Nucleic acid binder design. Sequence first.
DNA 1: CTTATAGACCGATCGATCGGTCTATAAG
DNA 2: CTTATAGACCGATCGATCGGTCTATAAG
Lengths: 188, 188, 185, 188
Amino acid sequence: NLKDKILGVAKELFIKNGYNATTTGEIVKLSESSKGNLYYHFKTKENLFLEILNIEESKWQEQWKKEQIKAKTNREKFYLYNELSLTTEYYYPLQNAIIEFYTEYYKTNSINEKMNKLENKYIDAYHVIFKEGNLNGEWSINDVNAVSKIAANAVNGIVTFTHEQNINERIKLMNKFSQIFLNGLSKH
Amino acid sequence: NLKDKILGVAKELFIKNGYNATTTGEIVKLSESSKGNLYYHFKTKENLFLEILNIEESKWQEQWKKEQIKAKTNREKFYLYNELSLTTEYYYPLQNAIIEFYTEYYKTNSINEKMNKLENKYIDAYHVIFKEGNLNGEWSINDVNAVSKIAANAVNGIVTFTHEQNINERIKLMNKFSQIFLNGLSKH
Amino acid sequence: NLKDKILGVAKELFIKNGYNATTTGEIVKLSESSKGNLYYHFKTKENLFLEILNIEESKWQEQWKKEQIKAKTNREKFYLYNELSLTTEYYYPLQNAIIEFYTEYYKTNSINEKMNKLENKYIDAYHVIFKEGNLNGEWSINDVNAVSKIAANAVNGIVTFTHEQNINERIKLMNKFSQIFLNGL
Amino acid sequence: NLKDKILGVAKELFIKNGYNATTTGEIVKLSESSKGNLYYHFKTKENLFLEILNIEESKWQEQWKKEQIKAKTNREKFYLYNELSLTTEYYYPLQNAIIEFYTEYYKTNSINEKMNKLENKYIDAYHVIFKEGNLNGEWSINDVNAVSKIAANAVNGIVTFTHEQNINERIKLMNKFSQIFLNGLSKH
DNA sequence: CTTATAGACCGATCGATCGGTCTATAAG
DNA sequence: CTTATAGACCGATCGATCGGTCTATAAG
């Protein structure tokens, strides 16, 4: 119970202040539990974070496969999946924290691999929208794992590095991007 | 000159470990000075950082001034800018610290302003490269703003979210993107 | 039942690490029990430790009682007592923890004698051996008390402080001491 | 200075309560300094301890260096060394903390080596007395290596495990001991 | 009731850590 | 005065540790 309360409050703060910047005490205060409790359930702050990450990944893989139904075309998917990046409440929100985290804990194998994993998931969602988009005669794409990578990483810059502007502004800026991108693909 | 030495080692550590991970103690150990001297020549770690961003962003602009000469067309600029912003050892190599720093001290719009100004200098390079082509038939985009931002964050996403790869590798990915992005532009 | 298994891991840990060094959660984990069950069968880490002490001292006394049967003379006894405090697995292996534990609690009258007589039982054995060795002409210790303490302590040092060499190596050391000591009476 | 105060106080405390039992908070309190300062002067609590140990062995090495002149025969030095061993305020008085510390850190090699080297110095001192005594014909020992370790650990027990007798009554036991030991070292 | 067994939860506090300040220098 | 260099020291915390307690279960 208090565990979940902690997982919840931790996410909120991490998204809002980042990893390092977010303090154990605050988590516990808001969570209304105890440091002793937080550390009872997660060997450490790092673990508290990776945990939240998994919980987040799944909470999304789930939202995508369930939300992409309404999309008919393999193109509509690209348009949507990118739009979600901004409207979602899972994984993307705490992207900054993820950088901040990977940045320093990049020399500890336990953490690294554990994160590239989530990374690739999103890299893949693209590999699919693109591949099956190929054969379904929507575009012929030479290298797909590259275009899928570009697309994944570029959409990421747009999401994390555009925070200052508005939701309905971001949602719109993203759409425009999707468009322009859904072209360099068309012919050769 | 220790101020130079110091600025120097501090750039390494910020690039290598990020903001919160770089400590004043390390900085004085590698620069071989003292807390006194470090704090004499600099007010706060914060202002140490900000000085560097600015001193860096400038050396970048100097680079670009010299590099864009060896280019004839705007489309040619794009590819070059984007590739440069991957090979340059100025400002981009600090994208990490810049993000964690922003995310934490974004609170008081004291650091908020300062950062935007720096990041807006980049959105501007694009606005030039873009409006310059809209007057050279290079292409046509009724909204150079939105596209200067898209291009800006996107390319940044490409640069920061890929530390994995080999530079030669990155360069190719970048160029692929340049082409793709450019493509989907002037065609009503 | 579990109380017994728990006493087991607890004893092992207290010997391997110190008293402070040994955590309850560790005890819980290695015995696969739980906090609840641990703090039900035992009142406190402190008491858990002491109970282990009394039991162990007990089984040692027992071991000595049997084991010495094979020692005709007091001289043979001495050598055996010493070699035994080296090979035994009761009580002596807990020396460290006893020390650490008292150094942080001899400040109370509770733990004071509560473990002070647990050891005088060792200066005792030496007293018997030396004494009964006097009324046997094996030697003429005109001060069993001193010599009895001296031996008990010298042996505790040799046992406690040389924990690095191998067991048979320690025994060689221990027997050499045994001979020198008797040899000097 | 405030560094020295810390060293002084941390010894008494360790001697009195043992390693794990002496808190950094208590040391700073009495030293009238701060945790910040203490952990600026010594990387860690353990390190503080070894530091103390170093000062201790050598302060001891001095006391002996000086006292071993009041003796004309190695037989003499043996009695002295053992007496000095339990009157000195150096090293020996914190055997408890050492024992404790040694077992708890038995696995960390850094510590192990350091700790052993320290102990060996005491064993060597005996080895010297014995070897000299040999060449001087005061006795004949075929295995001074062993008798040294024995003499050292034996004398150690008498010293650490008799904390309740009156010092002058203790130099009495020890002396009886030295007589026995030395005596049992010759043919009969 | 009693006996056991889990296990979530915490008060108290421990050993670090990290910006940064203050006093001492020295020399133009 | 100024610039510049050193370094002992600490305030404010921070993440984790560790005995130990309280509720929940179950079976006799």
